[PDB]
Amino acid sequence: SGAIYVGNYRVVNRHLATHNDWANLVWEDSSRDLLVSSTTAQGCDTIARCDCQTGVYYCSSRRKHYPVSFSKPSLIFVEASEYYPARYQSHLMLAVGHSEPGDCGGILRCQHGVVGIVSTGGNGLVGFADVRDLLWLD
Ligand SMILES: O=C(CN1CCCC1)c1ccccc1Cl
Ligand SMILES: [Zn+2]
């Protein structure tokens, strides 16, 4: 679990979005596994504006932050886990690291701020949904 809170926006994994998220829907993209909902209170996160390919992510299944190199956002086939199998996800970045069911919503950050949230994992890879192209979140 986990979310990004920037201005009056909450960014979550679309598949973890709550009733409240869908009641306050601003924007969702099935192909990116992202949903943005409106918040009453002000968020304190800043979104990175950069093409950083290094940063640090939070891994809840290890209670640890890991530094990683990660690929530029791309269209990628995500193999089966305990969710919908071999699905195509856009704006996805991969790194070598640990990701396990429950690690979704972990934030990936660089010196510029928030890059993305954990979305996929397995086989020693971690996938992050990029948010940096969503300039409107600012
Ligand atoms: O964190 C998740 C997604 N869900 C969050 C709560 C149940 C799982 C995940 C991470 C890595 C690999 C596969 C998955 Cl499903
Ligand atoms: Zn950066």
Side-chain angles (χ1 to χ4, degrees):
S1 56
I4 304 162
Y5 299 90
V6 61
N8 290 297
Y9 296 124
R10 169 176 141 97
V11 189
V12 288
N13 297 96
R14 189 188 181 277
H15 64 106
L16 299 176
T18 68
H19 171 101
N20 182 64
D21 283 323
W22 278 107
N24 291 290
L25 172 67
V26 173
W27 175 87
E28 58 79 33
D29 188 328
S30 176
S31 63
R32 295 178 67 154
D33 184 38
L34 281 190
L35 182 144
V36 178
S37 61
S38 49
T39 65
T40 48
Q42 245 270 342
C44 278
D45 279 299
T46 310
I47 313 298
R49 303 302 174 190
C50 67
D51 66 341
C52 281
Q53 269 191 83
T54 68
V56 174
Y57 79 102
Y58 182 66
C59 174
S60 56
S61 72
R62 298 273 183 279
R63 288 172 190 135
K64 274 218 222 291
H65 294 95
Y66 292 109
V68 286
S69 297
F70 55 91
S71 67
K72 247 80 162 146
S74 305
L75 180 54
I76 296 192
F77 219 40
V78 187
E79 196 48 64
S81 61
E82 302 325 316
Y83 274 92
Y84 353 77
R87 49 90 104 248
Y88 275 113
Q89 192 169 321
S90 70
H91 296 260
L92 186 66
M93 301 169 298
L94 292 184
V96 177
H98 183 63
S99 179
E100 193 187 312
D103 287 330
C104 276
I107 293 166
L108 172 65
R109 56 183 97 235
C110 63
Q111 67 270 30
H112 305 95
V114 175
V115 175
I117 52 170
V118 176
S119 182
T120 78
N123 299 349
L125 298 162
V126 49
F128 309 96
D130 184 44
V131 298
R132 293 177 290 187
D133 65 311
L134 304 171
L135 303 202
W136 56 259
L137 287 172
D138 292 325

